[PDB]
Design a protein around this ligand. Structure first.
Ligand SMILES: O=P(O)(O)C(O)(Cc1cnc2ccccn12)P(=O)(O)O
Ligand SMILES: O=P(O)(O)C(O)(Cc1cnc2ccccn12)P(=O)(O)O
Ligand SMILES: C=C(C)CCOP(=O)(O)OP(=O)(O)O
Ligand SMILES: C=C(C)CCOP(=O)(O)OP(=O)(O)O
Ligand SMILES: [Mg+2]
Ligand SMILES: [Mg+2]
Ligand SMILES: [Mg+2]
Ligand SMILES: [Mg+2]
Ligand SMILES: [Mg+2]
Ligand SMILES: [Mg+2]
Lengths: 362, 362
């Protein structure tokens, strides 16, 4: 695709600036510099680019309906692409750490960064932190001058914090709230009482909807100076909605999509994750299905995992997903309809994002 | 001490705000809220507070020589204390991750956060990231309104990045630059050719002098609006100097201070760290001392470590430290003398910081 290449060319610009700066203000030798180019390529590239592309889409949207000089068109698109990369670098950061926290094996068809032979956990934690700093380095370099800079950075760190908070929700989801205590070794739940639709939704709201949807949509508005031309409550509500759906597909895919298509290998069952499959399962299963699940869930044993998979198939959980999906389509089309009142171009952007998300295979 | 208590009371304010906000905008249950109060207390408290106190000192300095209304005095001190906590929270973040990367056991007389039974590595990585976000949450809450806010946040992230970059230098210091490669398992150096004074100094410049000295000194100026009344090159140079010395003491203490006085247990020998002791040792030892060191360094074996300790004692490395220290006193007093020309009050601040650093025991 010819817009993908234009986005990626801005990466090459950004990568060059970052690496030049390291050699020239941070006294880095070429081998460490090389290491960081590979760390940036490995953790920032080979994804769908839908977070960053989303910023560009929103910006091109306002550009088609507004008068601008050719140079402003250019600047604005360039700003959109750098903004896009901030979010991709923000994601890279989170995935590096997440793969560590989750015990993952592959991502984008390659081993997870920390599993690289010359990397390891000790380095990966810090590479992760580098990824996050890079995002602030870009912002300050490319946007120091822009009227949207405070707003952009205030949003970004609010989104970053929601995500970290959401991450803490996810990684403690298999613990009984009342037993959770830094002094005491955390035992897994036996009741699964907190695998509810409400709690599931809280987890996913924070760990994924802010950075996956809210941030790119609102950033696209910021770099367009168009935030006053939209109902912000509608934007928040639609980003939460689509973002929840996006995480539901992620959960479904963890268990049911073969790793070669997915580019990563599922770990939710092993990890005892409060995943959409698990919550939906516990919502429809009988007494004997529940008990069989309690005795097999949250263990690396390939045979116990096989059982949970067989339980999930038995429970016919694809019916539940069709119902789920049908309701989300209702509400998304609704919210897009509402967005049309003050901003038809933006609601068209939302519709493209939704379309891409709905039709996803990996 | 009665200024320590006033600083800590601002923590209680900040802690309350952060935790209230979680319950009221982030839907946190009391048990997760509790977990984060203990994580904040454990990682933010029980240290010397010299980074944050340093901001307060600098601010009180400009307040004694300037006319202000009683309310501005108050505001400015409050701002200084919140600024101070940003750096303490920034340090907390770095120590949580560092203890993981370094394989440490204790800090401030308690197990390292990740070694807590109810915490673990998976949670600690993220608690760490929370710590860093808290710093931006404070800034934006307390200072959204202040004229120094861009400057403060631009500096902070520049300092944060230098540190992360310095961390990558430290954790790869026992690798031969030319062998370092993400695809290939990293073998320790056999030559120790990169354990030089120049390389040592580059490591420490980035991993410690920016956040330990540059940031608090410059932040104290920012919240005082007094940055134009100082020679910034002199500030940078003195912060680098004192900060290097501070890391040298840290290295010396790692090996030679008993854990009960230190509050942490040394790991530099085991970890193959490019530490001041190692570099100085390699700088004065004979052919047979060097070879004996090469065969014992970078191994957890208590007996190989015993040997490196015995080699360090043999080499009479406390003479070298006295010479080192005598030269730093020369240059610090020099730089403080220079600081007196445009700003005598600030140079007095620097002198207090230096005095505290020089006379430290843990
Ligand atoms: O590993 P993946 O891709 O399956 C999965 O999506 C990863 C993921 C989702 N949301 C976040 C937020 C921060 C870091 C990682 N995140 P999950 O949430 O299931 O770990
Ligand atoms: O663990 P400590 O206290 O001995 C030691 O000081 C810790 C340390 C120094 N500088 C940094 C910067 C970021 C994180 C940790 N840092 P070291 O550098 O020797 O790990
Ligand atoms: C569910 C979430 C938010 C994590 C998976 O992220 P993506 O599937 O967007 O990862 P890439 O496309 O960037 O590989
Ligand atoms: C050498 C450095 C910079 C790390 C040790 O930091 P401190 O010795 O300042 O840690 P606390 O006083 O905060 O425990
Ligand atoms: Mg994961
Ligand atoms: Mg996860
Ligand atoms: Mg997943
Ligand atoms: Mg350490
Ligand atoms: Mg270290
Ligand atoms: Mg140390």
């Amino acid at each position: 695709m010819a817009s993908m290449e234009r986005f990626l060319s801005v990466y090459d610009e950004v990568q060059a600036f970052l690496l030049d700066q390291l050699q020239s203000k941070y006294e880095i030798d070429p081998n460490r510099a090389r290491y960081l180019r590979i760390m940036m390529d490995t953790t920032c590239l080979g994804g769908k680019y839908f977070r960053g592309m989303t910023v560009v889409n929103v910006a091109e949207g306002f550009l088609a309906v507004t008068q601008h000089d050719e140079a402003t068109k250019e600047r604005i698109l360039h700003d959109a692409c750098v903004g896009g990369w901030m979010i991709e670098f923000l994601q890279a950061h989170y995935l590096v750490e997440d793969d560590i926290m989750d015990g993952s094996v592959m991502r984008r068809g390659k081993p997870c960064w920390y599993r690289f032979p010359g990397v390891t956990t000790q380095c990966a934690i810090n590479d992760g932190i580098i990824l996050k700093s890079w995002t602030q380095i870009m912002a300050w370099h490319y946007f120091a001058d822009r009227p949207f800079l405070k707003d952009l950075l205030c949003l970004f760190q609010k989104v970053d914090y929601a995500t970290a908070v959401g991450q803490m929700y996810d990684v403690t989801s298999m613990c009984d709230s009342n037993k959770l205590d830094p002094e005491v070794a955390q035992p897994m739940t036996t009741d699964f009482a907190e695998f509810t639709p409400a709690i599931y939704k809280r987890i996913v709201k924070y760990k994924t909807t802010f950075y996956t949807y809210l941030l790119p949509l609102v950033m696209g508005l910021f770099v367009s100076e168009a935030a006053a031309s939209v109902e912000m409550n509608l934007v928040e509500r639609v980003a939460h909605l689509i973002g929840e759906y996006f995480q539901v597909q992620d959960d479904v895919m963890d268990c049911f999509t073969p790793p070669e298509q997915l580019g990563k290998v599922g770990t939710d069952i092993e990890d005892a994750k409060c995943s959409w499959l698990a919550v939906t399962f516990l919502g429809k299963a009988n007494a004997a299905q529940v008990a069989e699940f309690k005795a097999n869930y949250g263990d690396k044993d390939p045979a116990k995992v096989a059982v949970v998979k067989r339980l999930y198939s038995e429970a016919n959980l694809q019916a539940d997903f069709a119902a789920y999906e049908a309701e989300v389509v209702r509400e998304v089309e609704s919210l897009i309809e509402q967005l049309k009142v003050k901003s038809p171009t933006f609601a068209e952007s939302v519709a493209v994002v939704w379309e891409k998300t709905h039709k996803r295979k990996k």
